[PDB]
RNA sequence: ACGACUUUUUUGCCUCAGGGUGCUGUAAACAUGAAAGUAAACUUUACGAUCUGUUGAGGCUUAUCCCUAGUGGUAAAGUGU
RNA sequence: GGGAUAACUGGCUUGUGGCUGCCAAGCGCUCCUAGCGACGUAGCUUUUUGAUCCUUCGAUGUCGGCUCUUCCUAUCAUUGGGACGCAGAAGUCUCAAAGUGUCGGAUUGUUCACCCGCUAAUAGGGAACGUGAGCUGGGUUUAGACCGUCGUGAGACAGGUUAGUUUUACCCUACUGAUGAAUUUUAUUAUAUAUAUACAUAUAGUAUUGUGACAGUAAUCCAACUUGGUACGAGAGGAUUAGUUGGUUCAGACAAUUGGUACAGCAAUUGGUUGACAAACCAGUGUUGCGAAGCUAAGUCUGUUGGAUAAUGGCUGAACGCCUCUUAAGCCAGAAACCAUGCUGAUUAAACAAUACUAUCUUUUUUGUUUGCUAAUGUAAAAGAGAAAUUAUAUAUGUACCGGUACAUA
């Protein structure tokens, strides 16, 4: 079996779960959940929300 | 004069009056017809609704736009503790319908069955059943012989074991199951042989089978006409409200015609769903019941954190395609198809590819607790 | 040539205004009716990616104005369920004008184009810069 | 809606608690930490939005979530036949 | 004061309108009738308009829209057919058909109308001109106002235009849903081991399982492609039919997924307030962000096949030597129609069966039934209430041989 991987989160996506957003440029973004989708839509940078995995990677807290 | 434009009427006439069902348990209105040539066998089976999950399935179907790819489909889970058979019933045909000739019982019946023939089991002295149960085997044989000689349909009395479930109630569900098959003698033989033992789902169904599902719908109490029948709302300006029909009939004839919908009970209705394919028949003993050839991971059907309002499946279970009437914790009656099904669907072999066991409480990220612990690492 | 579209959620009811996104010289397209739409008591006609509309050009070159003209919808922002198991939506709604049997009027479709439309119109698929 | 229905009444059930599952988004607290600068000592002492560390933390999670022979509970005894 | 009398329905009639006939002079290349049909002539209908003034003036709320349901058929589409001036295709006329459907708009107060567009088709109607204690109030039909014409004037106008209160259900019924006792002038499809038995059976109480009379009833249409660039056709064009894959419209559910939703809950923060910090509170929900659970659609699943037929095509076959679908007797295939099947209800049958367990209880005999009570009587049918073959009807029944034959028998 395989899983896709999220864009905004670093989380693994089991099939039949999340949603897909295609930006005007032609970039596809897969978000695991609605909360991630809203957070992306409002244009927050993922590396600034402490709970999200991206901050953890950036802050040397792995 | 005629109405200015024409539409179908709101709501089917065919289920009126839309009153509450008599009973929580479903009822078979009619059984499949008795084709003589087939062996004796059960036609129905009782189960509890545990919840819904989604499944991933690979599609053979050619000439379809979808074709080769795997697709994601909703599916229902129905826990099925093995039924226990307790009685044999013989009916005979009369111009005034089926009349029961006699019933013959087993030599024991368990407490969970017994509780149903009382209202107040704790308060009672529990004196039901014991002296009839005693009477000697010649007597039973004499009645069986009478049944054997004259009866035209034989049905078996089966019951659920609710202690093998997580549900609150301990008064079992009793339900009759008609036997279709060979000679009256063979039919009788098969039920006698079965009698006091326990009957699991695998004896009644097969993989890839098409099944009929009978269940009582979700209750809502009394609901408004708009909700209950689908009527379009009136404009805002309206003086005495808007969420209600604007005419309930012409001047003549000078009565409210029944066909106009009015406010009232919605839900707790009896419903027969037809033609749902069974995707998988679980085995209680297996640790790998929810596993697949694609997945190869050890896991049970019960999703992460347990099914909402049903928790942990522990016996055998049916994974059924799509949806079926009624609530969580509800009994569901499975029935065989009235005519053997000859569709391109009914022949098909479902090699299911993945079964989700992630949470259904919030948006699940893992397939097991073991996965979750591994993902995060050390925590307080 | 096939027209077995498969159900994709309704969006774009009549009077919708979408981006034109081609080299015709139309800038926008106003959809006035959808082909093959039902007859029904008070439901607006409406479209989806696979549907053939009839539209007019409000802003654009003059000769494209006023004429009723056929178009095909290429992008939509109302979410739809692709059967593979996820919900798609595009950033903004868009279609392209066509000859009645679906031949594309210009030469290049500038946005990306859903595959669900691409499979349904070969002559349109060609001139799409990417298929998604 | 009220009735009614569905239940249970000590291998139960209610009750908290622990665990599970999520949801939120990193508590208070302390640092001779960082921080735009600032001011005042004969390098040290003041103020300081904010930030970092201890901190995927803290809080909440059945009232109509899940599990637990874990805790403590479990009255009235009426009335009709 | 008036239904002695108008403006509104209904009623009679049906001139008027609408719809259908019959004739056959012609039209239809030739050709009365494929399609037509003048000159004429007979009806029907009450969706029109009249004529009328029977009913209502101690008030039947006066147009239209919205919504909603049912009925009709004089059929528009869909189904099945027949005819053709029918090669295919397109189509016209026509018969069974009312099962199922019959749309988005622009403009108008509009019925009406006209476009534009979709369409499978955008059929025609009824129900107090269906629908005001359902709404709406744009129009018409109060008081104010304007302009014209008309009037010396007050003022007039089937001329235009503008501002102009829409009341009451808690009654009875109805209908939709919710409970619910009572039910002997009453029932009854058996009981009993090739024989019995209504002149008999049936207490009651809970409860479970069913029975299922009877009542209700639901699925619908399209596209695309294969059949086939074939049949057919001079070429151009160009199928029915199956079949395969999809969708529409409706119905019935459902919430895994997605979306919607917030006085579960966390977080953020403006203004004030508790000396500060912390904790908070308050701004009728302070305002935001996320937001479980539950509902929910714009999201997901699911929506049979026999019987008997109509129209019609046939078959055997006389009447009438022949012929003849029967316009006789006998038959057959055949439709979205009909009835089942299926599905819903079944205190719609004051319906009913089986089973589990239970409350002095049962039998015979005797005498009686001439504080509200504490012994107690009713008959729609007693006077010998007598009678189980079974099948025809222009023949039956036994019996014997093997429905035929023979012989008896009513």
Structure notes:
Chain B: Keywords: Metal-binding, Ribonucleoprotein, Ribosomal protein. Chain B: GO terms for molecular function: RNA binding; structural constituent of ribosome. Chain B: Mg(2+) 1 binds at residue 360. Chain B: Mg(2+) 2 binds at residue 369. The structure is cut from a larger assembly and holds chains A (62 residues), B (380 residues) and C (132 residues). Chain A has 62 residues and is α+β, with helices and mostly antiparallel strands. Chain A is built from 2 helices and 4 strands, in the order E-E-E-E-H-H. In chain A, strands 1-2 form a two-stranded antiparallel ribbon. Chain A has a two-stranded antiparallel ribbon with strand order 3-4. In chain A, strand 3 (19-22) and strand 4 form a beta hairpin. By secondary structure, chain B is an alpha+beta fold. Helices cover 13% and strands 27% of the residues of chain B. In chain B, the strands form 3 sheets. In chain B, strands 1, 4, 5, 6, 7 and 8 form a 6-stranded antiparallel beta sheet that branches. A 6-stranded antiparallel barrel of chain B has the order 2-3-13-12-9-14. In chain B, strands 10-11 form a two-stranded antiparallel ribbon. Chain B is globular and about 80 Å long. Chain C is mostly beta strands. In chain C, strands 2-3-5-6-9 form a 5-stranded antiparallel beta sheet, with no helix packed on it. In chain C, strands 1-4 form a two-stranded antiparallel ribbon. The interface between A and C is medium-sized, with 13 and 15 residues. Strand 3 of chain A pairs parallel with strand 8 of chain C, so a sheet runs across the interface.
